[PDB]
């Protein structure tokens, strides 16, 4: 088909048809029949307007103005100008040709059958406001006015179309030739009574029927209406511009400094800085989690065989006995021989997670009749002050440990300079954050959530024991299989994915909770035994906690591995900005330093109230830890606070660059930000750090 199009027509005609039809906002390839029709129509109208010419008085020796082919905007404005200059009605459809003699717009068309019916239906479509000439492949012609075209033009057009018709059937193209009326089948659209009434009752105040609105829109000249409306508008409608200044900015959410409010609890799913993995060196083979947990407990047999618990702390509502018996059942199941990791002593599991205390649903009619059934008030989040453990979390998760848990596959050889730059950036990033404790915590988190999601494949009405395991590698190359504790997941009879399935997790730790009583108001902790590392006894506690999460939360935890890409993108944006200051890449220079440049240093934190600098590696580690904490501590409060602190930070930046920022309703922004600082540890610590950094910027801007 397309070959016929490019062979039977000149390149200019094909290009004009293609660019005029591509404005339909659709694929021009899969439907080329209309392309052929439009090309033939363009050729016909071009031929029609190449033989007859006019003069100062109208000597026949141009007379035809071509509107099709040109851009629709230019064509429409030209048609409107012609109609205005000639004092004639403008056709509602874009006429394909205009005549200077008759002072009327005209249309052309191509068909396959008799042209009389086509002409009559086109007349019905356009009424009598436009003239037409029509030709058909089967030697038929129709003209509204016999004084429109001469014999030469009609004969040439007829010969061309007859030749095209004859040639089409030679390559089996006439069979697939679509007609012309199909593209304009729908021209009748009559509204029913109901829809007409709905339209009539949907007009702005001041009109009775939609006819009045239509006439008002099509007739009235509203020039100058905006000024008239604005003149009488009250002066009270003002943005109230206010130039911003350094002193205008104030600390956000000072209540967090109120010592009366309680400390923020530790609501993260898994222990991050207090983890304790029972290392068990392995060759490197992959084994089922149950076998790994069994071997790890066998190595530390003393902890496994602990039956008398030395309770150290208790939650407000949880029962220590039930949790301990559930943990004993979990370890018994882990240490058995059956392949399945399914609990068989469902008693304590059922009675420990409060799975039997759920209310029973009754028919709505009884509730309506009943008077004691009333909606319960929403438990709005409490308000808490600064929690000192978030600072320790951030400090420790950014340190370099002796083990790494990242092993990514390989990539093809790098050739292009951009590939070399990307590979260098990746090398520096991984080298910097390979052993960072945040990476290991992130891997544990994602692996545990993946296992939780997998266990929900077919087991939904049964309790499943899942060990919190991890695969780690050290500098020497020997790889270990760490076990961080266990967790039993309950049943979710409902098939919904956003339905909480209660899971209770027992994680080992080496930190005595009594040191920070406010850090664990939600944990039940025992003391199982004592490990020896360098001949010295260090205690081991078992933090037992009930929790509730849904399948979508499992998916979120699984995707929590995106913190790596997030941190890499942030570092790459920093490097791209540094390189954009210059004209060349700044990766090695800002990491290691070249002859011209020096190793870039970033302000990391505070030491005894004084600023401290550090290498770009420390900044990368802090960025990764911040991203991981943001993902782990994520709730609606955190995202809202970040979204509003965006605006506050942008205003501060504008202030720094001496751009003279102006604020309209500053207190509105401050209220929007403070609306989200209620109980999230990450949000509260972010507010504290923002206040500290704002103070530092204020005190440093006076120099």
């Amino acid at each position: 088909m397309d070959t016929f199009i490019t062979r039977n027509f000149q390149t200019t005609i094909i290009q004009k048809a293609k660019n005029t039809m591509a404005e339909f906002s659709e694929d021009p390839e899969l439907q080329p029949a209309m392309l052929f029709n439009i090309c033939v129509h363009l050729e016909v109208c071009y031929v029609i307007s190449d033989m007859n010419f006019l003069d100062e008085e109208g000597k026949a020796y141009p007379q035809y103005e071509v509107i099709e082919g040109m851009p629709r905007t230019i064509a429409w404005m030209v048609q409107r100008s012609l109609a205005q200059e000639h004092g004639i009605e403008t056709p509602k459809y874009l006429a394909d040709l205009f005549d200077y003699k008759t002072k009327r717009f005209i249309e052309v068309g191509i068909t396959k059958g008799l042209a009389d019916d086509y002409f009559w239906k086109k007349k019905e479509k356009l009424g009598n406001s436009m003239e037409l000439m029509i030709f058909s492949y089967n030697q038929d012609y129709s003209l509204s006015n016999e004084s429109s075209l001469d014999e030469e033009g009609k004969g040439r057009v007829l010969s061309r179309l007859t030749e095209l018709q004859a040639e089409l059937s030679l390559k089996n193209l006439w069979q697939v030739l679509i007609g012309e009326e199909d593209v304009e089948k729908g021209i009748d659209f009559k509204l029913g009574q109901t829809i007409s009434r709905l339209r009539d009752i949907s007009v702005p105040a001041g009109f009775s029927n939609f006819e009045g609105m239509r006439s008002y829109i099509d007739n009235i000249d509203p020039k100058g209406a905006i000024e008239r409306n604005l003149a009488r508008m009250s002066p009270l409608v003002s943005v109230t511009p206010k130039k911003l200044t350094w002193e205008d900015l104030r600390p956000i959410g000072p209540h967090i400094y109120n010592h009366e409010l309680p400390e923020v609890p530790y609501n993260a799913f898994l222990l991050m800085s207090d983890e304790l993995g029972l290392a068990n060196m392995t060759e490197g083979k992959s084994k089922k989690p149950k076998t790994l947990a069994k071997e790890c407990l066998e190595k530390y047999s003393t902890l496994r065989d602990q039956t008398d618990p030395i309770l150290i702390m208790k939650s407000e509502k949880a029962n220590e006995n039930f949790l301990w018996k559930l943990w004993r059942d979990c370890v018994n199941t882990i240490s058995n021989e059956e392949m399945s990791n399914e609990l068989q002593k469902t008693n304590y599991a059922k009675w420990a997670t409060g799975d039997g205390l759920t209310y029973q649903k009754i028919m709505k009619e009884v509730a309506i009749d009943d008077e004691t059934m009333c909606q319960e008030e929403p438990k709005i989040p409490n308000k808490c002050r600064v929690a000192a453990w978030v600072q320790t979390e951030m400090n420790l998760l950014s340190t370099l440990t002796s083990k790494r848990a990242l092993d990514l596959p390989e990539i093809g050889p790098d050739v292009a300079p951009v590939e070399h730059v990307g590979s260098e950036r990746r090398k520096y990033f991984v080298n910097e954050i390979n052993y960072c404790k945040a990476s290991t915590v992130m891997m544990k988190y994602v692996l545990f959530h993946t296992s939780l999601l997998n266990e929900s494949n077919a087991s939904m009405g049964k309790y499943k024991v899942i060990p919190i395991t991890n695969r780690v590698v050290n500098e020497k190359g020997e790889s270990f299989d760490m076990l961080y504790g266990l967790a039993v997941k309950g049943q979710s009879h409902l098939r919904g994915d956003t339905d909480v399935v209660t899971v209770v997790t027992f994680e080992f730790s080496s930190t005595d909770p009594r040191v920070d009583s406010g850090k664990w108001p939600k944990y039940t902790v025992f003391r199982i035994g004592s490990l020896f590392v360098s001949g010295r006894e260090k205690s081991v506690y078992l933090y037992c906690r009930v929790n509730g999460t849904n399948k979508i939360q499992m998916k979120w935890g699984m995707e929590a591995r995106r913190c790596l890409l997030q941190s890499m993108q942030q570092m790459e944006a920093i490097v791209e900005q540094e390189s954009s200051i210059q004209g060349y890449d700044m990766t090695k220079a800002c990491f290691k330093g070249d002859r011209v440049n020096s190793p870039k240093t970033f302000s990391i934190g505070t030491q005894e109230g004084k600023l401290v600098k550090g290498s770009f590696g420390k900044a990368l580690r802090v960025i990764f830890t911040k991203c991981l904490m943001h993902y782990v501590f994520g709730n609606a409060q955190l995202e809202g606070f970040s979204a509003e602190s965006r605006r506050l930070l942008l205003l501060i930046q504008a202030l720094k660059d001496r751009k003279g920022p102006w604020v309209f309703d500053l207190e509105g922004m401050y209220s929007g930000i403070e609306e989200c600082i209620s109980n999230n540890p990450w949000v509260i610590q972010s507010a504290y750090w923002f206040n500290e950094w704002l103070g530092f910027e204020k005190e440093g801007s006076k120099v």
Binding site: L230, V237, P241, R647, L650, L651, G660, P661, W662
Partner: protein, 50 residues
């Protein structure tokens, strides 16, 4: 000419959009010398874009 006239123009634009039903956010908007701004989660700053 001066920032005062620029803010008068901003106020006039605010009133105009109010007349068209568009309500500008005073609690989430700010003004600064041209060259640095944001547009649909895309920060522009003197050529750099993030």
């Amino acid at each position: 000419k001066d920032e005062e006239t620029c803010m008068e123009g901003i106020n006039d634009f605010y009133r105009t959009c109010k007349l068209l039903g568009i309500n500008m956010s005073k609690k989430k908007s700010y003004c600064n010398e041209t060259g640095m701004f944001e547009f649909t989660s895309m920060f522009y700053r003197d050529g750099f874009v993030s």
